[PDB]
Structure 1
């Protein structure tokens, strides 16, 4: 919302900040009033670049920095890969070496051509998918579930503490 305005229609960005960026294969600071303008003609084409987002390729995002928008979306997609837990590797260096390669992949995708990244990602798909990728999908789902359970346990304990001290006072 801190951006000066859209490259074409920097108006709404001044009147109200309600508009949120729209992510695309192009990687852009697109705005809903401008998304309508893209829908009317082309229907999924970047105005200046003309990149054929035939799917309109639109998804909501909330950060004034377009570079952060693209980086966060690319990281979201990448996290689906190389999600194996650290303890799977006993080697000290290998704990974060693969994370280094992951973030290198993210930076490569942000600016440089993604053809090599896609070919590499196919290579990693084939092998880790045999065993490890689905296993770590399961384990990360388990840890998400248990963290939401633990936060609800914390909030049950806080509600019980509030209501029991109220019943202390009234009793």
Structure 2
């Protein structure tokens, strides 16, 4: 929980166990405290690089979904452009051999 770090406020996880955490598109985890604290100071920029955040692309949740950063990125990359490939490949393949390349 507190081992992944915190961007701006840095003092929020130690104040409330049932904290509402959010995610973005580049691949970070920002709680609800960093959303309002960064908007009154700047806007929607990535604390590490430069990722613009205009639309409401935040997924609010209080169950602590992003546990491991490795298993949360593979679930978003498949349900984006790889989920649409589940129909085009069966229209040309003939054996279970090319499906191992997608995995």
Secondary structure, aligned partner of 2:100: helix
Largest Rg, 1 or 2: 1
Q: Give the Cα separation in 2 of the matches to 1:48 and 1:72.
A: 18
Point out where structure 1 has 5 or more consecutive residues left out of the alignment: 103-171
Structure 2 portions without partners, runs of 5+: none
TM-score, structure 2 as length reference: 0.57
Q: How far apart are residue 32 of structure 1 and its match?
A: 0.6
RMSD over aligned Cα atoms? 4.4
Q: Deviations over 1:95-146 (max 9, x none)?
A: 76555433xxxxxxxxxxxxxxxxxxxxxxxxxxxxxxxxxxxxxxxxxxxx
Q: Comparing both chains, which one has the higher relative contact order based on Cα–Cα distances under 8 Å and sequence gaps of 6 or more?
A: 2
Distance 2:20 2:47 in 1: 18
What number of residue pairs does the alignment pair up? 102
Q: Deviations over 1:23-74 (max 9, x none)?
A: 1122112111111012223332223433212225322356768683564254
Change (3 A) 1:89 1:97: same
Is 1:30 the counterpart of 2:30 in the alignment?
A: yes
8 Å CA contact retained: 2:21, 2:31: yes
Q: Report the CA distance shift for 1:39/1:8 in structure 2 as closer, same or farther (over 3 A).
A: closer
